Amino acid sequence: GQVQLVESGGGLAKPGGSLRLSCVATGTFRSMEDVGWYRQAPGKDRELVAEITTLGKVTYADSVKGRFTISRDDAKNAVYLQMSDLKSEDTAVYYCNIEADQTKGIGYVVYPYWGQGTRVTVSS
């Protein structure tokens, strides 16, 4: 099996601005399972921003809760992050992680996939 991710929507905003991140998965998979947005600034560890498990459980990092909203479209196999009320600490490369169900027969073969990411700069 193959998976390709296309991440987009990243750009520059000033404090209080808005962006919309998008990630679209194509390839040979049965379905998307757990999906989430992450971010890595220089000198820091990559951190979870928001996630929706295949069972529907939603989770936000405390630092973005109430500001960011993750959603997923399982017909189109796409995952979105609406980022509003942007703060300068939000600056980082953002990565969507998509678990792909790659089962060929009956089972639950699931591997996680990363993209090249999309850059967000929140500048003074």
Added chain:
Amino acid sequence: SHPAGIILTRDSYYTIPSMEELARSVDENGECIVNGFTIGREGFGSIYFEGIVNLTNLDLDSIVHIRRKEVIVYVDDQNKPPLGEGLNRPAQVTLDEVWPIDKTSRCMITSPERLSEMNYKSKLENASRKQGAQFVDYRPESGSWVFKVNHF
């Protein structure tokens, strides 16, 4: 078991009854018919077909593929027999080491605490349902997932 025409040569695969016993189970009509049949692959899983199964000339090398976290039975629908014939019939699948993969490290997650926090069992229940299978069991300490199907 050449004499029954059963073709199973792959390493790690086995049958119950054993291939050697099926070799000694050909009736007066050239047929090998058993009551309850399992084909398994050690380290990966097994498939148990209840009831009377005619095994004669079954090309198990081509038909049955037990892999990590999935089974494939009849890979081409043009070669699949009708419902109730061959191995296209009710079956109970046991898959071994059914564990999620860490999203960043790609490592297997085996700790029962992390499994329960992801509710991995519920993930397997949903995956069974979405495929039309009947979830039977999940043992976290071994990663054994059991489910049943009406056919393949």
